[PDB]
Amino acid sequence: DSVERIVENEKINAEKSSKQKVDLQSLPTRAYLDQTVVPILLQGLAVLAKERPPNPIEFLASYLLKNKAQFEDRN
Amino acid sequence: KQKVDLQSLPTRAYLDQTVVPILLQGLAVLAKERPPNPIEFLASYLLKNKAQFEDRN
Amino acid sequence: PRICMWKYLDIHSMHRLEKAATVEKMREVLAELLELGFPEQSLRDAIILDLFSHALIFCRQQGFSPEQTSAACAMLQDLHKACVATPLGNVEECYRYFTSVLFCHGIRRPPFSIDLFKEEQLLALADYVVNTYFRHFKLYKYVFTP
Amino acid sequence: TIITNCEDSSCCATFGDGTSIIAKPQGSYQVLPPNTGCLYIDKDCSATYCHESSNNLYHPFQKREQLRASRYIMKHTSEVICEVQDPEGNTFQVMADGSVSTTLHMQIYGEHVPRFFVVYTDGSGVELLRDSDIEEYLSLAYGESTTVVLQEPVQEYPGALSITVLRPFHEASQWIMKKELDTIVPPNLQSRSWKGLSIGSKQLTNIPAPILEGPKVLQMRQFIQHEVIKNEVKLKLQISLKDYIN
Amino acid sequence: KRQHHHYLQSTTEVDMRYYNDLLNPIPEEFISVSLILHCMVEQVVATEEDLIPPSLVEPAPRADGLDYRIAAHIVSILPSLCLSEKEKKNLREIFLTEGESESKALPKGPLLLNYHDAHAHKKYALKDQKNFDPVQVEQEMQSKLPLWEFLQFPLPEVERAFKVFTFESLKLSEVDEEGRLKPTETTSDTDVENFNIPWDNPARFAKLIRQRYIHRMSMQKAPKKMVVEADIEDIKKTQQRSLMDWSFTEYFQPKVLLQVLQEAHQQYRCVDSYYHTQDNSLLLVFHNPMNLQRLQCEHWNIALHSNVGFRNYLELVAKSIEFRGYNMGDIPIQISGTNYYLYPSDGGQIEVEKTRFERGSTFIKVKVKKDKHNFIIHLKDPSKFGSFSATLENGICLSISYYGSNGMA
């Protein structure tokens, strides 16, 4: 019975990616980055390249701080 | 490195001459550190070390 | 020997194939696009679908630009039709025919050609092409020729 | 590679580089890095790191090891989140509110030794290296059976001696493991051509690595040992410089 | 409010395929930060230029004639057949690509690699990569770091002893009694003394003594023939350290030295540079200036400008403009942080950073550096959050929390 329950738990864990914060602190570099900042960074870079403000670092930081809610709560 | 001609550069050149050098170190620190708030930490790093990359242009 | 870009698969169908990240869904999309029937009722359509599907899979494995995608798909379809156009053994004629067709894509002289491509990728094909199908030419000959 | 126990459920996980982590059912852990150090996590997730090398090998720099031995106690469930005592006796404490406190030529660096570089105009450079840091590295090099260390006097530099170190490496991923037994086949059916679970400092008896007869990658590090400058030479150069300025 | 108004006038699925195609054929053990960011940029350029991601793409037609794939079947089918020792590679040069038929005379991996040359190792384990060189890509991204300017500085054992004595006479950066870094005073008269090293340019040092002496007459003459003669104590006073225990020197290549400089940049906070006028060389010192208590402090407060509402404009932004604002929907961004650097005598490092958002949460981070290992605690709102993370020398990452896998108290 224990083996079957472990199989079911592995099924659920493969179906649900563990997005818990402490689990995130151990994931590999590429996996840690992809699930944390990659999409929002790509969106910020796209907006920066389309607009090209004279202050690019400040604009990118502003975009990250403004749109962090659209990428931290979706997880 | 004038702010007017940076706008006319290609996308890759503009990104490489504007945010790539600082984003490299920001993401390196983020990956080596991994704080519970990745987006906020990266933004704070970009704001904190913007002087070391904006004064070189 | 002409430019076979956006001849059988356009940008929209290719984008549909691109959104299909899995082998099975992409096989379904290719079957929908090629107007082929279900693979379970005819073996010829199944063979064609498998050929195109695996082709897209390995082309995923390496990586290039979309106009190249359509050119390669249309050239495959054209040379398959040429190989099955006659029942007699016609390996060398299709050989030389598409040998001529390369230069209509590998070297820059419009309007007969256009430089969409690189030498390394070319030679890769010379390689893979003369490796497989003209070895398996009789297999498709027995199936698609009267 | 998982080595776990079937009675007290104690487990140990070893990685390709040789990092071994031992877990206990009570909730405590012990991470053993392959080179140096020892990290222990208790039931309360309290981290304790030890610089003291687990192996009892004869290190000719035991005095230097005592200067580097320190215990870093580190907790995230207490007001004091970081505390450590150095061999000099200074006590460093970091409080949970971000505040810090410490209780206590000629520039002395000890182990916080700066790195000096001399960059030329072609992009190359020469780094000045402390004698103690190199002798310790060479001592570990002479102790390894697969490490070949070469010396020959410089054909041009008088008195200087260049030291070269050779070490075989891995042609592929270091994390690719190798099983304990290369073959499990009975020694005769081949066609011919415990001590206790002492998680403590059990010496990892490195079987002298099979002599790689022409290994495919040799890691290299080359040094240049010059003659030490004496005060007599230093004083003489000061006299010549004084006559230069005058 | 008029000043506030004038101050203003002055699915989510992100296309992911292009980046994935450039790292999937690459093992994670070699996927570095510089490589990931490069494929970020290529993803954006492809999105703007409508460049379809490389992978799901057929390509370049044929001079004996047909499509793409079924010998990636064959070139994989090939190797199990019937006989001898010459036609598999003639049918692996006609049947494994002419482009890869460029079989170099076995120079790939049998090769000596430097102890500090990590890029040469990545080039061997990835020697079979096609149409993409991550090693060259990684080198190109690192060339945009500030450390690259040290390798390209502008131009205008006895020699070995002089260089060592120059380092001994070099004055490094210092910190005050509180640990704050001492600013480089740009005072006209005292800046001359730092650049006059008797071991590098004694001519300036000869004039420094001449200038110092002429001043001494001037104070004495106010109501061998004077022969200004330098003495040994004038040269001895310039010495600041002793490098008599530095007899080992290691030579690096321009591509190898850059990696060494990057490694020292992550272990040291201050990098001091001096130009050696004798041989046109640049001298670099990677050190950590400390006070008597072994502490370095760093305070930084940044109030990012916003369209802060009338209440938020007056509280945090009005005083700072007594730019250019950005849209946040009346949420001020004022980030203040304190950095503490502790260095016990054992060679370890304790880096503590406390970052607080004026309208957000307070985050405290304690990093312990010892034996090239990294041990880190993350705390939020001192607790609400607590977790311990570690990163060893080999790159193995650890994470554990007493409050569970969420770390949430």
- Residue D155 has, within 13 A of its CA and on its CB side, a CA count of 0
Residue of B nearest to E138 (CA): B24
Across the interface, which of E254, E354, E368 has its CB nearest the CB of D124? E254
Going by their DSSP bridges, the two strands E270-276 and E111-114 should be labelled as unpaired
Nearest to E33 by CA among B16, A38, B25, D174: B25
E245 neighbors D109 (Cβ within 8 angstroms)? no
Sign, CA torsion E274/E275/E276/E280: positive
What residue type is assigned to position E63 of the chain? A
Going by their DSSP bridges, the two strands D29-32 and E248-252 should be labelled as unpaired
E180: left (phi over 0), alpha (psi -120 to 50) or beta: beta
Distance separating alpha carbons of residues E100 and C123, to the nearest angstrom: 9
Distance separating alpha carbons of residues C43 and C45, to the nearest angstrom: 6
Nearest to E70 by CA among B32, A14, A6, C79: C79
Determine contact: E363 vs chain D, CB below 8 A: no
Tell me how crowded residue C26 is: count the other CB atoms within 10 A of its CB. Answer: 21
Nearest to D51 by CA among E24, E18, E327, E348: E348
Distance separating alpha carbons of residues A65 and A67, to the nearest angstrom: 6
Distance separating alpha carbons of residues E217 and E396, to the nearest angstrom: 67
Determine contact: B42 vs chain A, CB below 8 A: yes
- How far apart are the CA of E200 and the nearest CA of chain D, in angstroms? 11
User: What are the structure tokens assigned to C60, written together?
Assistant: 């995923």
- At D31, give phi and psi (nearest 5°): -100, 130
User: What are the structure tokens assigned to D180, written together?
Assistant: 């304990």
Tell me how crowded residue E264 is: count the other CB atoms within 10 A of its CB. Answer: 18
Distance separating alpha carbons of residues E342 and E295, to the nearest angstrom: 5
Distance separating alpha carbons of residues D235 and E232, to the nearest angstrom: 9
CA E42 to chain centre: 22
Please calculate the CA angle B6-B9-B11 and round it to the nearest 5 degrees.
110
A25 neighbors E387 (Cβ within 8 angstroms)? yes
- At E284, give phi and psi (nearest 5°): -125, 140
User: What are the structure tokens assigned to C16, written together?
Assistant: 């549909």
Distance separating alpha carbons of residues D166 and D220, to the nearest angstrom: 5
B22 neighbors B46 (Cβ within 8 angstroms)? yes
Distance separating alpha carbons of residues D67 and D79, to the nearest angstrom: 28
User: What are the structure tokens assigned to C32, written together?
Assistant: 């929908």
Based on C-alpha coordinates, what's the Rg of chain A?
18
For residue E366, list its beta bridge partners.
E352, E377
Chain B residues in contact with A51 (beta carbon < 8 A): none
- Note if the bond before D60 is cis, omega within 30 degrees: no
Going by their DSSP bridges, the two strands D20-23 and D29-32 should be labelled as antiparallel
User: What are the structure tokens assigned to E326, written together?
Assistant: 């950005």
Residue of A nearest to E398 (CA): A26
Tell me how crowded residue E103 is: count the other CB atoms within 10 A of its CB. Answer: 11
Question: Are the Cβ atoms of E398 and A26 closer than 8 angstroms?
Answer: yes
Contacts of D221 (CB under 8 A, 6+ apart): D164, D165, E114, E115, E116, E250
Contacts of E248 (CB under 8 A, 6+ apart): D128, D129, D130, D131, D133, D134, D163, D223, D224, D225, D226
Tell me how crowded residue E205 is: count the other CB atoms within 10 A of its CB. Answer: 24
Going by their DSSP bridges, the two strands E349-357 and D125-129 should be labelled as unpaired
From which experimental method does this structure derive? cryo-EM
- At E114, give phi and psi (nearest 5°): -65, 155
User: What 3-state class would DSSP assign to C74?
Assistant: helix
Which of E41, E44, E49, E375 is most worth mutating to test chain A (most A CB atoms within 10 A of its CB)? E44
What residue type is assigned to position E37 of the chain? L
Distance separating alpha carbons of residues A28 and E396, to the nearest angstrom: 9
Nearest to D127 by CA among A3, E250, E392, E327: E250
Chain C residues in contact with E15 (beta carbon < 8 A): none
- How far apart are the CA of A10 and the nearest CA of chain B, in angstroms? 26
Instruction: Report the length, in residues, of chain C.
Output: 146
Instruction: Provide the greatest CA pair distance for chain C.
Output: 45
Contacts of D144 (CB under 8 A, 6+ apart): D167
Q: Map tokens 């290609």 to a residue.
A: B10
Question: Are the Cβ atoms of E380 and B36 closer than 8 angstroms?
Answer: yes
- Residue D239 has, within 13 A of its CA and on its CB side, a CA count of 6
CA D115 to chain centre: 18
DSSP for residue E147: G
Instruction: Provide the greatest CA pair distance for chain A.
Output: 64
Residue of A nearest to E405 (CA): A22
Distance separating alpha carbons of residues C63 and E59, to the nearest angstrom: 8
Across the interface, which of E52, E65, E74 has its CB nearest the CB of C131? E74
Nearest to C136 by CA among C53, C51, C70: C51
Please calculate the CA angle E225-E226-E230 and round it to the nearest 5 degrees.
140
Chain A residues in contact with B20 (beta carbon < 8 A): none
Q: What is chain E's percent helix, strand, coil content, to nearest 5?
A: 30, 20, 50
Distance separating alpha carbons of residues E146 and B25, to the nearest angstrom: 10
Based on C-alpha coordinates, what's the Rg of chain D?
25
Nearest to A59 by CA among E7, E225, B43, C107: B43
- How far apart are the CA of E120 and the nearest CA of chain C, in angstroms? 24
Distance separating alpha carbons of residues E237 and E169, to the nearest angstrom: 9
Determine contact: A69 vs chain B, CB below 8 A: no
Q: C-alpha distances in angstroms, B40 versus B52, D72, E294?
A: 19, 29, 30
Instruction: Provide the greatest CA pair distance for chain E.
Output: 111
CA D51 to chain centre: 10
- At A65, give phi and psi (nearest 5°): -75, -25
Instruction: Report the length, in residues, of chain E.
Output: 409
CA D87 to chain centre: 19
